[PDB]
């Protein structure tokens, strides 16, 4: 256990939409695996359903495409038609607010899902504490 165990409110009965306050982006994956951010809130693949696999891990999946978000050896996030130890994810409260979403793989390193002001996804080794990249707020579709 390298990380704290604060727990946001909520449930994963609905699916959600992951707002970055960073920039104002929601998370998006695209059906050719590519993920990324948008503010356009009619965009098709930003409604993301998460699941528990324990207490305070989730999948996040894209609801029209399929795909489950991983983060590879690299720290770069990606979309997969099936799930494996790259796609779970440390759901938790930060800043008694706001989700944060830590690699379960890379948790001992700190990575994050992340969105930069710009709209791209953070590296994990790019992420850490303390940063806006890493607040996302769950918006109902």
């Not at 699916?15 to 104002?24: A, E, F, I, R, T």
């Not at 948790?107 to 994990?124: I, Y």
Request: glycine share 10%.
């Amino acid at each position: 256990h390298h990380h704290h165990f604060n727990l946001p409110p909520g449930n994963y009965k609905k699916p959600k939409l992951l707002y970055c306050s960073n920039g104002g982006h929601f998370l998006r994956i695209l059906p050719d695996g590519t993920v990324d951010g948008t503010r356009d809130r009619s965009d098709q693949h930003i409604q993301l359903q998460l699941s528990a696999e324990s207490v305070g891990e989730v999948y996040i999946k894209s609801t029209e495409t399929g795909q489950y978000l991983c983060m590879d050896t690299d720290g770069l996030l990606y979309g997969s038609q099936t799930p494996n130890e790259e796609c779970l994810f440390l759901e938790r409260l930060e800043e008694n607010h706001y989700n944060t979403y830590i690699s379960k793989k890379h948790a001992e390193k700190n990575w994050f899902v992340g969105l930069k002001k710009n709209g791209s996804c953070k590296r994990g080794p790019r992420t850490h504490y303390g940063q806006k990249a890493i607040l996302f707020l769950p918006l109902p579709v």
